[PDB]
Amino acid sequence: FSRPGLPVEYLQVPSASMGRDIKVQFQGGGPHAVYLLDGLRAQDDYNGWDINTPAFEEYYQSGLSVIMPVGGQSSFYTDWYQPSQSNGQNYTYKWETFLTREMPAWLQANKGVSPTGNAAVGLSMSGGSALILAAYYPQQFPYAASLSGFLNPSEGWWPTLIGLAMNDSGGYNANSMWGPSSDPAWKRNDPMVQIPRLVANNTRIWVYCGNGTPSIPAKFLEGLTLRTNQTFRDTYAADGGRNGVFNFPPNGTHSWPYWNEQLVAMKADIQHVLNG
């Protein structure tokens, strides 16, 4: 979708913590950057944002760099306890370490991208991830967006539902990631639980949730997902949050066209927060 000729590079960025090189699609355009995180079925060739949207073209000459890490199927962009126990994964996912230490160090030294003052933007799987990244690394991420995110992953049925989704997407094991649902890692990585961090740090947060996919069990799931997002909004407000944008248009969909529309819509917001 992005027109050809844009200054998009394909970088090999070593991850010491994962023992392998991570491919990163990169468009330079300023010291502060938008980190575009992929969904549950993240591929190893291209980030879903580049496959499905004109994101690079839309942010060309925005005054912001654009970073699209490639890979991490079912990873939740988190640091796992162990290699996924069932599908033969022969290393441990350490994607939080990659995104908060290894990759920004690489981009600082080699490109001049600032490790501080950036935006994390995620969808589906990574909507919660973006918020968690800002919750724990507020200097790196004064801005976070969650598009159709799952924002109370530790609560009720959600750890089991997440486990089911991860198994469907490449046979990954949620127990290898954050342990049993009683493990402290589930609450650590739950955006709802970490709302006080988002408030204390005055993070700019952009939260979108659609009402369905363009295409009954799915209808129940989507209603539950919207309700979790609305509860997140309500809890954020109750805990003193004052720096959020909450987009719940009834005709909004869970689709790459609407997630792209949100990415374009938030551009001015990110520019104002990161570049003043």
Swiss-Prot record:
One Gene Ontology cellular component annotation held by this UniProt entry: extracellular region
Residue numbers annotated as active site: S124, E222, H254
Principal location: secreted
Localization in the cell: Secreted
Enzyme Commission number(s) from the entry: 2.3.1.122, 2.3.1.20
GO molecular function: diacylglycerol O-acyltransferase activity; trehalose O-mycolyltransferase activity
EC class name: transferase
Binding site for substrate: L40, R41, S124, N152, L224, T225, L226, R227, T231, H254, S255, W256
This protein's record includes keyword Secreted: yes
UniProt entry keywords in alphabetical sequence: Acyltransferase, Secreted, Signal, Transferase
Catalytic activity: an acyl-CoA + a 1,2-diacyl-sn-glycerol = a triacyl-sn-glycerol + CoA; 2 alpha,alpha'-trehalose 6-mycolate = alpha,alpha'-trehalose 6,6'-bismycolate + alpha,alpha-trehalose
Region feature (Fibronectin-binding): 56-66
Cited function: The antigen 85 proteins (FbpA, FbpB, FbpC) are responsible for the high affinity of mycobacteria to fibronectin, a large adhesive glycoprotein, which facilitates the attachment of M.tuberculosis to murine alveolar macrophages (AMs). They also help to maintain the integrity of the cell wall by catalyzing the transfer of mycolic acids to cell wall arabinogalactan and through the synthesis of alpha,alpha-trehalose dimycolate (TDM, cord factor).
Oligomer and partners: Homodimer.
Family: Belongs to the mycobacterial A85 antigen family.
Official protein name in the record: Diacylglycerol acyltransferase/mycolyltransferase Ag85C
Organism expressing this protein natively: Mycobacterium tuberculosis (strain CDC 1551 / Oshkosh)
Lineage: Bacteria, Bacillati, Actinomycetota, Actinomycetes, Mycobacteriales
Whole sequence portion shown: 47 to 328 of 340
